[PDB]
Amino acid sequence: MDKFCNSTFWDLSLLESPEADLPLCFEQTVLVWIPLGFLWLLAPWQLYSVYRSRTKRSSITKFYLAKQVFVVFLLILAAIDLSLALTEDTGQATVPPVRYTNPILYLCTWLLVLAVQHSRQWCVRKNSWFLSLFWILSVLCGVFQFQTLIRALLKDSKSNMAYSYLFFVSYGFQIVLLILTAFSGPSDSTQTPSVTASFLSSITFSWYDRTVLKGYKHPLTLEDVWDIDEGFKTRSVTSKFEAAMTKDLQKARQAFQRRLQKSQRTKDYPKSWLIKSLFKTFHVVILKSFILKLIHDLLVFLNPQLLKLLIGFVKSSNSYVWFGYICAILMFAVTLIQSFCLQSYFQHCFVLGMCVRTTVMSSIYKKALTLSNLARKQYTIGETVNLMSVDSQKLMDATNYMQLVWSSVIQITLSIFFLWRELGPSILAGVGVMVLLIPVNGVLATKIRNIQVQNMKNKDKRLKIMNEILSGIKILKYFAWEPSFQEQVQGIRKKELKNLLRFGQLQSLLIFILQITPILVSVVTFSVYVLVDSANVLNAEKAFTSITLFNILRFPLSMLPMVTSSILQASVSVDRLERYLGGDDLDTSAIRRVSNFDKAVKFSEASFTWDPDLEATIQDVNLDIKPGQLVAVVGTVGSGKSSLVSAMLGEMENVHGHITIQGSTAYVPQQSWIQNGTIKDNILFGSEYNEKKYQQVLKACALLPDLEILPGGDMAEIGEKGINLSGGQKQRVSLARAAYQDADIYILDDPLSAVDAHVGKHIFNKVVGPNGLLAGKTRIFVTHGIHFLPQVDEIVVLGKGTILEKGSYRDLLDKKGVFARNWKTFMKHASLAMRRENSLRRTLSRSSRSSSRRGKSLKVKFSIYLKYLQAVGWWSILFIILFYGLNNVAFIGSNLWLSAWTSDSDNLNGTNNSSSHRDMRIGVFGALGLAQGICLLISTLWSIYACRNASKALHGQLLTNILRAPMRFFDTTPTGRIVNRFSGDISTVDDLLPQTLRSWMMCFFGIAGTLVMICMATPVFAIIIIPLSILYISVQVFYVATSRQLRRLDSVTKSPIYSHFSETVTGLPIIRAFEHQQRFLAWNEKQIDINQKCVFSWITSNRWLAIRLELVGNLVVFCSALLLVIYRKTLTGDVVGFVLSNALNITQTLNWLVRMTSEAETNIVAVERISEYINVENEAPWVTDKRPPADWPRHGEIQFNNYQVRYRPELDLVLKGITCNIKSGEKVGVVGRTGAGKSSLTNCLFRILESAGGQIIIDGIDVASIGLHDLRERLTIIPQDPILFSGSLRMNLDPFNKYSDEEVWRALELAHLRSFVSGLQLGLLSEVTEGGDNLSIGQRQLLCLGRAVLRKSKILVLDEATAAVDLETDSLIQTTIRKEFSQCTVITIAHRLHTIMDSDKIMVLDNGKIVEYGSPEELLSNRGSFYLMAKE
């Protein structure tokens, strides 16, 4: 067959030459039969599989014509080649038989290509794997022919200019076709591009390349992320799952039933069916992921072998040059292909995890709607929504880590094999270190978790103290108490800081072990290797290929414990879920919803029970209600009327009889149920909107006054924001919803409980009365009132679960049997915050085991960074940076030394075999490893102490400044916001931020060390890191910008699923009664899909990132390999080893660095907010220059001078120049219009509001010229609303401990708390809960006045809140104030006139100005505004 080209084809010796080109005939035979063979062996299948497809869908577009035209051009070239071959046949006497076989072949093939590119018009995926891969393969195989011909043409050998030139042009067209087939075509109608993108643009996730730009320009919104395709929609996956489940569930139910009946002749449930059902429904994706993972696990072990070949080549100086370029190119190609396989495996695996979580949440919801009440009472609503919110997450985590449990053992076994095959049985020393460091990592992780839990408890205590400080800041300002509470929260914070330091030290040990495992394993392996034998030499190939294999081995061997832990947690999660879904549905045998019947409601001989073991709550019942027949059942409390209602709907288990119901029911429960949303949405309750009926039912049910009181009217949002409607509004809203629903039977069940009498009668008359809106509808009332009965249609009295009698009210008042007796007698008739946070703690402490591999599974202005770094210190971060740079320099030195230890095998100069030399080598290698370890410990421990100092200082400043901010700041800012800055931002600064910054430093220095090694070998590489740096910088910028918003959107969308599930499982009787299950199913599926698209877009963002980063690391490896092949005449094999076994470890560090840059951007906003509250404006100085004469109020003489005060510097004066005077000892009341300036007086004597004009002078000293605390301590107050600080009676009465126990007891006896306080066990140290739960209201203000009396100043400003307190309390207050504060100036602010005439003086204050002065005796003679207001 050699004659086919008149020249030899399989020579194999032309390669054995410096400039070694392939033989032409070999090329034109096999490098042409490979692509054409691929095209022909599969094309009939592609055509046979496409021409049985959907509509022609032959939209004639621009790529389709471009590709057809280029293939036509190229067919024309093939025909021209045939013509020239025949023309040469007319010339020479002999022609190779292939000179026409090759062109003819192309002719046929291109027709086929023209018939495949047209075929694509029928499919949705235009450019598929087949034709795209054929173009790749053809362009790849033709480069050999290209290079041969061009090299021969520069020789000007005159062989054939025409053949060579037509080949050049045909190859150009094949390049343009490959490019034009990579491009995803002109996308059709607005589908997600995941299913219209070409093969290459879908392998590299380059169809996501426009979401990333779009998210970088302006932030993404829920309408900027494309919908997930229809195969993942909740309805689709749940339908598939239920088809695959029903059979397994039934089989397990049969097994459980047979087991129970065998036992009998709750700890058993139909079990071991969920995991089989999930595999039987997702097995195709399981296989796809399995095969992709297998291919990647086999491809991982080619790069060490190519590295071995390249070291060997650079060593042997008599080798060819075409070998080594081939090895560098193969390193690039293998890393590219394994990147594609791995990223596609992640996409499959993570989307399968998402689909498993989706189908499980949807199954949970579908089951909660039909769970038997007997099985529904076992759980709690918090625990059920927990079953949705943690169990499905655990099952998703197991689904992600499911393929690692065998992939990691394949990788471990192959790595042990390939390490053995190089370094003999002394590999087990290194692998033994690697394995033996697993229990140590576990021990450190356990101690970390214990410290974290104790810290969490201590943090919650501090947070509760802070919350009671902030919510009662007014009193704390009054009595000058911020130093005491400052010290208390400082003590708790000091405890938390010590725990944080211990956490830090263990984290440091964990980091040191993580970063020193590789150097220690290599020193142990090489020492044990070179020692155990004399003829056991260590050369560059063994040393550096074994180092590469150790870096491959150490990742699976460390992730294996966490994978097994995740599987074992998901096992118990599966048991919990599988127990929920197996519980039998509620039975509807007893209650039948027929369509036609004689009576609307018919109870036939029925008894019903909550729990069959006990006696029936409702006994035998025989009754019938015809349409329109209003019935008002009445009975003793606990008789079962509420139970009768509950049984009618179906919320009871039948013990006997049955019930017939026709039409649609409407339920008004005793327990009110209001969904999250607006009053209008609740009233409509998912029904058609009609303004006539809507306004009629608002008017009838008397909501209009409530809407007028409420801010938004019928648009106010209930729940999740907080309106907490009083029982009247809730009950009216429920009744309005029922009335608007327009049902057939209305089961009114005590709908006038929390309602006033007259409004209740109005509601009865215009809602359920005979003239009400519900005249024609059967309406069963459940009454605790009587006055409605004289006009109700019919009465059924109930007792002991049985009807005593039924009749009209006339019969009730006439028959005088049980009728009159009943008529006479009836007159006298949180859970998630501590658990949902636990799963976040677990998945953040388990995915924080990055180990430079944070691709395992994942979950701003420079001034802010400068603020944090200024807090942590500047010398500290200088020495942290320096002592990690020393670590990296020692690592570079260690590699350089190993390169000079493997080198003494080549230069076997006699002296490189003595035992002293080997001892020196292994000793200095160990010393370099030890120096690296010491530098790392110093750096990390210093980092921990410095970052602890930063956290301490930041919290100190924030708390010292918040406690000293004028009351306007606390009025204009929600307490929730400040507490949230003290809770989740001090925590971020404490825990997450230091480790994120430290890890960023470690990644940066690892990269810099690798790059300086590469550039130390071949310095030209310092120029190929200016474009690589630009590519990497652009990648991280785009990825972090987009991923931040995707994570935010996912978090925003996740919560509504659980909120809606909790609202469904809470108000289930109402949903079932209105017959609204399908609407709620649809809503839950909609919310799940809206979340699903965000989480899927996040997954794809991660894959986009990973492809780009593996490309950057691949280009580093490939460029260094090329520069070490090119420059081989000046370097050695050892340099190749240590340059190229490190560049292989540059993609993991790049992934880690991008992830940590994103994390630092996310976390530093905590410092942003903390620094925002550090700078909040402060009050006046507490102590400025002056002191009192040991007692500033001598007798309480207060003088005003046209005082003018403003609430906020941009507003109008509330006081407009008051000029009055109070002498020593008089009692002054102040009066006026509502909002005329009452509050400002008691708010301005304490300087809480600074003067805008005028001044107040006490005892000849102006208020504005003394320190704020100095003045504020010397007065006295009884605040408007008594706030009690949780703790001890001693602290509440006296936190400063300045008052002795004897006088505290004397003041408490003056306040007369001996009966209540002395009777307590501890006495004056009795615990005080958060205000209430003890110390009755009267005790509360009596304690407040005790505080006032032990303060015992000469000035008593006070005001009254409400008269709800017992009159004895007010009388005691006034008597005490008059008996022990008689000789003290008193100012009272009262809006109740009846307690003011007793005052020695009254000030009249309207519109912020005085009206009259003098005593009430001096007033009442006149008839001024005081008279116009008093006694009326």
Author numbering: 1 to 265, 298 to 861, 895 to 924, 958 to 1530
Authors' text:
In the absence of nucleotides, rMrp2 adopts an inward-facing conformation with the TMDs open to the cytosol where substrates and drugs can access it. An unusual feature of the rMrp2 cryo-EM maps was the presence of helical-like density within the TMD1 and TMD2 interface that corresponds to the regulatory domain (R-domain); MRP2 and other members of the ABCC family contain an R-domain that regulates their transport activity upon phosphorylation by specific kinases (CKII, PKC, PKA and PLK kinases). The R-domain is predicted to be partly helical from the AlphaFold2 model and it links NBD1 to the elbow helix (short helix at the amine-terminal of TM12 and it sits perpendicular to the TMD2), but in the predicted model it was placed at the interface of the NBDs and outside the TMD whereas in our structure it sits deep inside the TMD. Although, continuous density from NBD1 to the helical density can be observed, only the helical part, residues Ala895-Lys924, was modelled as the rest of the density is weak and without defined side chains; in addition, there is no density that links the C-terminus of the R-domain to the elbow helix. The R-domain is buried within the TMDs at the interface of TMs 8, 9, 11 and 17 and it is stabilised by several hydrogen bonds and Van der Waals interactions. As the R-domain of rMrp2 is deep inside the TMD1/2 interface, it points to an inactive conformation that would prevent bilirubin glucuronide or drug binding and the formation of an NBD:NBD interface. Since the R-domain in our cryo-EM structure is partially phosphorylated, Thr869, Ser874 and Thr886, it suggests that phosphorylation of these residues does not relieve autoinhibition (full dephosphorylation of rMrp2 did not alter the ATP hydrolysis kinetics either), but their role might be to stabilise the R-domain. Although the R-domain is observed deep inside the TMD of the rMRP2 structure, our functional data show that rMrp2 retains its ATPase activity adding further support for the concept of the R-domain equilibrium.
Multidrug resistance-associated protein 2 (MRP2/ABCC2) is a polyspecific efflux transporter of organic anions expressed in hepatocyte canalicular membranes. MRP2 (multidrug resistance-associated protein, 2) is a primary active transporter of the ATP-binding cassette (ABC) class. We have built an atomic model for rMrp2 that consists of a small N-terminal transmembrane domain (TMD0) that is linked to two transmembrane domains (TMD), TMD1 and TMD2, by the lasso linker (L0). Each TMD consists of 6 TM helices, enclosing the pocket for substrates and drugs binding, and they are linked to two nucleotide binding domains (NBDs), NBD1 and NBD2, where ATP binding and hydrolysis provides the free energy required for the transport cycle completion.
